[PDB]
Amino acid sequence: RFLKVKNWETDVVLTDTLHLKSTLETGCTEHICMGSIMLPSQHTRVATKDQLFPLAKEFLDQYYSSIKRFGSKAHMDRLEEVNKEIESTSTYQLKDTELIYGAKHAWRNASRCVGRIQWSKLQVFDARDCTTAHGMFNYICNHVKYATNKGNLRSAITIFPQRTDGKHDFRVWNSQLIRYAGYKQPDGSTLGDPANVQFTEICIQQGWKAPRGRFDVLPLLLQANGNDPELFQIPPELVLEVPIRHPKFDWFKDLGLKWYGLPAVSNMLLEIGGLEFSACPFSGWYMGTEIGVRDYCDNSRYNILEEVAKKMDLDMRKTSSLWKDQALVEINIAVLYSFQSDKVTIVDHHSATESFIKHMENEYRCRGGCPADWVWIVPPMSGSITPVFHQEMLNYRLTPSFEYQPDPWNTHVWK
Ligand code: HEM
Ligand SMILES: Cc1cc(N)nc(-c2cc(Cl)cc(CN(C)C)c2)c1
Ligand SMILES: C[C@H](O)[C@H](O)[C@H]1CNc2nc(N)[nH]c(=O)c2N1
Numbered sequence: 001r002f003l004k005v006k007n008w009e010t011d012v013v014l015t016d017t018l019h020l021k022s023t024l025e026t027g028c029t030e031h032i033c034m035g036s037i038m039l040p041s042q043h044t045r046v047a048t049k050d051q052l053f054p055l056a057k058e059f060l061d062q063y064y065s066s067i068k069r070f071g072s073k074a075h076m077d078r079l080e081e082v083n084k085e086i087e088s089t090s091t092y093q094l095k096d097t098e099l100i101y102g103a104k105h106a107w108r109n110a111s112r113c114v115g116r117i118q119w120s121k122l123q124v125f126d127a128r129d130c131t132t133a134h135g136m137f138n139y140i141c142n143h144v145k146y147a148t149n150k151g152n153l154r155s156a157i158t159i160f161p162q163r164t165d166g167k168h169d170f171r172v173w174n175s176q177l178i179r180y181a182g183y184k185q186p187d188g189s190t191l192g193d194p195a196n197v198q199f200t201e202i203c204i205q206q207g208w209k210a211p212r213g214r215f216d217v218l219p220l221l222l223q224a225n226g227n228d229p230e231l232f233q234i235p236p237e238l239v240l241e242v243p244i245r246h247p248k249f250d251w252f253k254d255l256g257l258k259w260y261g262l263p264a265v266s267n268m269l270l271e272i273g274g275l276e277f278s279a280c281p282f283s284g285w286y287m288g289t290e291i292g293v294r295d296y297c298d299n300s301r302y303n304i305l306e307e308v309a310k311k312m313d314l315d316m317r318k319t320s321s322l323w324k325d326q327a328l329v330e331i332n333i334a335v336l337y338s339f340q341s342d343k344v345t346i347v348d349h350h351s352a353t354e355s356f357i358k359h360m361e362n363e364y365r366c367r368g369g370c371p372a373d374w375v376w377i378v379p380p381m382s383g384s385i386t387p388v389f390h391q392e393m394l395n396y397r398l399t400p401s402f403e404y405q406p407d408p409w410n411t412h413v414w415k
């Protein structure tokens with residue numbers, strides 16, 4: 001009831017008791033492990049008033065135990081106060097401090113996130129007074145500007161009104177605030193990002209005039225209080241982009257690649273004390289491999305391993321020449337170099353995985369554990385020359401938490 005995790009590169013052993021406070025379920029059983037299912041039936045997100053107070057009580061107990069005032073009068077009065085409001089309203093409203101705490105701890109508990117060493121330096125923007133899609137756009141624009149900070153990126157989250165009935169949900173229909181468009185071609189192939197081909201057509205369905213090229217920043221589709229979503233263009237001066245060059249290969253600029261500085265996930269759901277925030281865009285900075293390995297080299301993404309290998313002049317006939325591996329390393333040397341020469345914050349997969357082990361140590365010391373998803377923590381190249389490959393990790397689900405949720409267009413009762 002006090003599990004141990006070993007690092008087989010350093011013989012370091014850590015004792016996890018934090019998993020005892022775990023509540024949600026993982027998808028695994030005594031006779032099956034689903035640790036490589038991407039969106040397990042559990043990791044996806046309707047509440048009643050009866051279920052709400054245990055969740056509220058549980059959360060308020062964490063928060064007051066945090067500010068070193070656990071079970072005191074201000075706690076018991078806040079317990080009764082929320083209890084009473086869940087009678088009156090069959091819901092309740094978080095204090096600003098309770099919001100900041102929950103948001104920071106949703107990140108802290110995100111077991112697939114290798115960047116959590118920074119979990120306590122998160123900037124929380126309360127957009128719970130928003131009422132309209134235009135309001136959302138304005139709030140989202142201030143988020144991009146603040147988080148980008150002229151290349152010196154800063155962690156931030158903007159929290160729109162919580163779900164109430166279910167049919168009055170605030171949703172950002174984009175999967176990220178800033179993503180490039182993808183257009184299928186009249187011959188089958190794909191221009192821009194193949195990930196977004198459906199979403200790009202939904203934007204054109206709602207009136208977007210597409211410049212139909214490579215790296216066309218998509219407009220924002222914003223749904224407010226359950227109403228139909230509306231298109232908004234982020235002022236280009238707010239979209240900071242890095243053109244990708246190599247520090248040895250002068251032909252690498254002629255590849256004409258670029259990526260945006262700001263990674264900002266907008267399709268997830270923030271859960272705090274049983275309350276559900278359907279729109280909560282959050283942003284940090286990139287680990288290089290997200291761009292150079294996954295975005296640029298996934299077969300169903302930009303898929304440039306073909307063209308980079310050519311210009312390098314590689315033995316592309318045999319699978320075992322490792323021409324793919326070889327072009328993969330250069331591509332990530334270029335992403336890192338380009339972002340660094342422009343003073344745009346980025347982290348290499350070696351530095352970020354070392355910081356995660358450091359972070360893991362702090363969480364096992366001053367918290368008793370650190371939920372972690374090995375399948376997701378290990379970077380998508382050079383696995384075992386990073387220290388997380390050699391580190392056992394217990395995965396378990398704690399609240400507050402970020403959760404996946406269905407796309408709005410598979411569930412929105414239109415008009
Ligand atoms: C500070 C810099 C950050 C870095 C370097 C970072 C890095 C990463 C990476 C590489 C992934 C894997 C995504 C993929 O490969 O597809 C990830 C996932 C994730 N990150 Fe972080 N991130 C950062 C900030 C944040 C912030 C500010 C939040 C929330 C407030 C957050 C919450 C998450 C969540 C929820 C996931 C998905 C995990 C899941 O599905 O359970 N991250 N992060
Ligand atoms: C705040 C943040 C920072 C970072 N460095 N990354 C992420 C991220 C999360 C997800 Cl769930 C997916 C992706 C990118 N994939 C589409 C490749 C990035 C989020
Ligand atoms: C099948 C598998 O679960 C899936 O491809 C996962 C593997 N690990 C990952 N790890 C990260 N960081 N990001 C991902 O998208 C994935 N995809």
Ligand SMILES: [Zn+2]
Nearest residue numbers: 028033034035
């Ligand atoms: Zn398992």
